[PDB]
Design a protein around this motif. Sequence first.
Motif, PDB file in Angstrom:
ATOM      1  N   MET A 111       0.862  -1.206  -0.026  1.00  0.00           N
ATOM      2  CA  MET A 111       0.028  -0.037   0.010  1.00  0.00           C
ATOM      3  C   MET A 111       0.861   1.220  -0.011  1.00  0.00           C
ATOM      4  O   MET A 111       1.587   1.466   0.969  1.00  0.00           O
ATOM      5  CB  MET A 111      -1.232  -0.106   1.276  1.00  0.00           C
ATOM      6  N   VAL A 112       0.640   2.073  -1.032  1.00  0.00           N
ATOM      7  CA  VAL A 112       1.316   3.446  -0.963  1.00  0.00           C
ATOM      8  C   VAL A 112       0.784   4.252  -2.053  1.00  0.00           C
ATOM      9  O   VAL A 112       0.141   3.923  -3.288  1.00  0.00           O
ATOM     10  CB  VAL A 112       2.927   3.021  -1.906  1.00  0.00           C
ATOM     11  N   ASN A 113       0.570   5.687  -1.296  1.00  0.00           N
ATOM     12  CA  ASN A 113      -0.542   6.372  -2.091  1.00  0.00           C
ATOM     13  C   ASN A 113      -2.070   6.114  -2.139  1.00  0.00           C
ATOM     14  O   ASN A 113      -2.166   5.261  -1.026  1.00  0.00           O
ATOM     15  CB  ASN A 113       0.033   6.786  -3.434  1.00  0.00           C
ATOM     16  N   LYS A 114      -2.741   6.602  -2.694  1.00  0.00           N
ATOM     17  CA  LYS A 114      -4.102   6.398  -2.512  1.00  0.00           C
ATOM     18  C   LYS A 114      -4.549   5.115  -2.400  1.00  0.00           C
ATOM     19  O   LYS A 114      -5.329   4.544  -1.940  1.00  0.00           O
ATOM     20  CB  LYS A 114      -4.747   7.233  -3.682  1.00  0.00           C
ATOM     21  N   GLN A 115      -3.855   4.369  -3.377  1.00  0.00           N
ATOM     22  CA  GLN A 115      -4.303   2.923  -3.517  1.00  0.00           C
ATOM     23  C   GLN A 115      -5.716   2.906  -4.404  1.00  0.00           C
ATOM     24  O   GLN A 115      -6.890   2.569  -3.502  1.00  0.00           O
ATOM     25  CB  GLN A 115      -4.536   2.008  -2.394  1.00  0.00           C
ATOM     26  N   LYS A 116      -5.707   2.956  -5.737  1.00  0.00           N
ATOM     27  CA  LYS A 116      -7.109   2.644  -6.518  1.00  0.00           C
ATOM     28  C   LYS A 116      -6.719   2.633  -7.861  1.00  0.00           C
ATOM     29  O   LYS A 116      -5.539   2.316  -8.157  1.00  0.00           O
ATOM     30  CB  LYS A 116      -7.947   3.917  -6.078  1.00  0.00           C
ATOM     31  N   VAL A 117      -7.795   2.536  -8.679  1.00  0.00           N
ATOM     32  CA  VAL A 117      -7.684   2.340 -10.090  1.00  0.00           C
ATOM     33  C   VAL A 117      -6.773   1.154 -10.443  1.00  0.00           C
ATOM     34  O   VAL A 117      -6.424   0.319  -9.593  1.00  0.00           O
ATOM     35  CB  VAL A 117      -7.212   3.587 -10.517  1.00  0.00           C
ATOM     36  N   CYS A 118      -6.410   1.307 -11.735  1.00  0.00           N
ATOM     37  CA  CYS A 118      -5.380   0.411 -12.223  1.00  0.00           C
ATOM     38  C   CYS A 118      -4.088   1.235 -12.354  1.00  0.00           C
ATOM     39  O   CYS A 118      -3.645   1.888 -13.647  1.00  0.00           O
ATOM     40  CB  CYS A 118      -5.719  -0.414 -13.602  1.00  0.00           C
ATOM     41  N   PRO A 119      -3.020   0.851 -11.554  1.00  0.00           N
ATOM     42  CA  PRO A 119      -1.849   1.161 -11.825  1.00  0.00           C
ATOM     43  C   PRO A 119      -0.904   0.710 -12.858  1.00  0.00           C
ATOM     44  O   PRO A 119       0.223   0.985 -13.132  1.00  0.00           O
ATOM     45  CB  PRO A 119      -1.034   0.814 -10.350  1.00  0.00           C
ATOM     46  N   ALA A 120      -1.594  -0.213 -13.751  1.00  0.00           N
ATOM     47  CA  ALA A 120      -1.036  -0.890 -14.603  1.00  0.00           C
ATOM     48  C   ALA A 120      -1.096  -0.314 -15.935  1.00  0.00           C
ATOM     49  O   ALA A 120      -0.312   0.611 -16.501  1.00  0.00           O
ATOM     50  CB  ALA A 120      -1.546  -2.344 -14.554  1.00  0.00           C
ATOM     51  N   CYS A 121      -2.359  -0.125 -16.252  1.00  0.00           N
ATOM     52  CA  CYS A 121      -2.598   0.152 -18.044  1.00  0.00           C
ATOM     53  C   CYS A 121      -3.266   1.447 -17.722  1.00  0.00           C
ATOM     54  O   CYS A 121      -3.280   1.987 -19.183  1.00  0.00           O
ATOM     55  CB  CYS A 121      -3.308  -0.866 -18.569  1.00  0.00           C
ATOM     56  N   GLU A 122      -3.422   2.177 -16.985  1.00  0.00           N
ATOM     57  CA  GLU A 122      -4.334   3.375 -16.935  1.00  0.00           C
ATOM     58  C   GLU A 122      -5.627   3.041 -17.289  1.00  0.00           C
ATOM     59  O   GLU A 122      -5.981   3.624 -18.177  1.00  0.00           O
ATOM     60  CB  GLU A 122      -3.555   4.587 -17.597  1.00  0.00           C
ATOM     61  N   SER A 123      -6.452   2.238 -16.450  1.00  0.00           N
ATOM     62  CA  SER A 123      -7.802   2.025 -16.771  1.00  0.00           C
ATOM     63  C   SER A 123      -8.486   2.066 -15.345  1.00  0.00           C
ATOM     64  O   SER A 123      -8.165   1.015 -14.352  1.00  0.00           O
ATOM     65  CB  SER A 123      -8.037   0.998 -17.374  1.00  0.00           C
ATOM     66  N   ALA A 124      -9.451   3.288 -15.138  1.00  0.00           N
ATOM     67  CA  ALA A 124      -9.766   3.373 -13.989  1.00  0.00           C
ATOM     68  C   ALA A 124     -10.940   2.214 -13.307  1.00  0.00           C
ATOM     69  O   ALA A 124     -11.470   2.281 -12.210  1.00  0.00           O
ATOM     70  CB  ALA A 124     -10.257   4.667 -13.577  1.00  0.00           C
ATOM     71  N   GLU A 125     -11.350   1.766 -14.478  1.00  0.00           N
ATOM     72  CA  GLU A 125     -12.397   0.817 -14.308  1.00  0.00           C
ATOM     73  C   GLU A 125     -11.898  -0.497 -13.758  1.00  0.00           C
ATOM     74  O   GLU A 125     -11.497  -1.537 -14.640  1.00  0.00           O
ATOM     75  CB  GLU A 125     -13.175   0.446 -15.682  1.00  0.00           C
ATOM     76  N   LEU A 126     -11.908  -1.120 -12.395  1.00  0.00           N
ATOM     77  CA  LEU A 126     -11.775  -2.351 -11.931  1.00  0.00           C
ATOM     78  C   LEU A 126     -13.114  -2.991 -11.530  1.00  0.00           C
ATOM     79  O   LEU A 126     -14.420  -2.393 -11.601  1.00  0.00           O
ATOM     80  CB  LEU A 126     -10.884  -1.832 -10.594  1.00  0.00           C
ATOM     81  N   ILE A 127     -13.070  -4.022 -10.944  1.00  0.00           N
ATOM     82  CA  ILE A 127     -14.223  -5.004 -10.591  1.00  0.00           C
ATOM     83  C   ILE A 127     -13.967  -5.864  -9.772  1.00  0.00           C
ATOM     84  O   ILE A 127     -12.780  -6.408  -9.583  1.00  0.00           O
ATOM     85  CB  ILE A 127     -14.774  -5.680 -12.208  1.00  0.00           C
ATOM     86  N   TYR A 128     -14.751  -6.296  -8.813  1.00  0.00           N
ATOM     87  CA  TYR A 128     -14.748  -7.275  -7.809  1.00  0.00           C
ATOM     88  C   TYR A 128     -15.007  -8.807  -7.994  1.00  0.00           C
ATOM     89  O   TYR A 128     -15.353  -8.868  -9.271  1.00  0.00           O
ATOM     90  CB  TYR A 128     -15.538  -6.814  -6.539  1.00  0.00           C
TER      91      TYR A 128
END
Length: 50
Positions: free
Chosen positions: A1-18
């Motif tokens: 855990m580092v900074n906000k922790q959200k979205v995709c750090p990988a591809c730049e695609s803010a759409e994740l899913i559970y």
Amino acid sequence: MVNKQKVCPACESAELIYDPERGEIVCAKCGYVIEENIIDMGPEWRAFDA
Ligand SMILES: [Zn+2]
């Protein structure tokens, strides 16, 4: 855990899913998981005795 922790750090695609089956949260783009161990209590899963 580092900074906000959200979205995709990988591809730049803010759409994740559970993923309730694994306890996971993946990308909706690149396929990339985020975390996949959304728990830390341990009722009866680790360590056995008697
Ligand atoms: Zn992604």
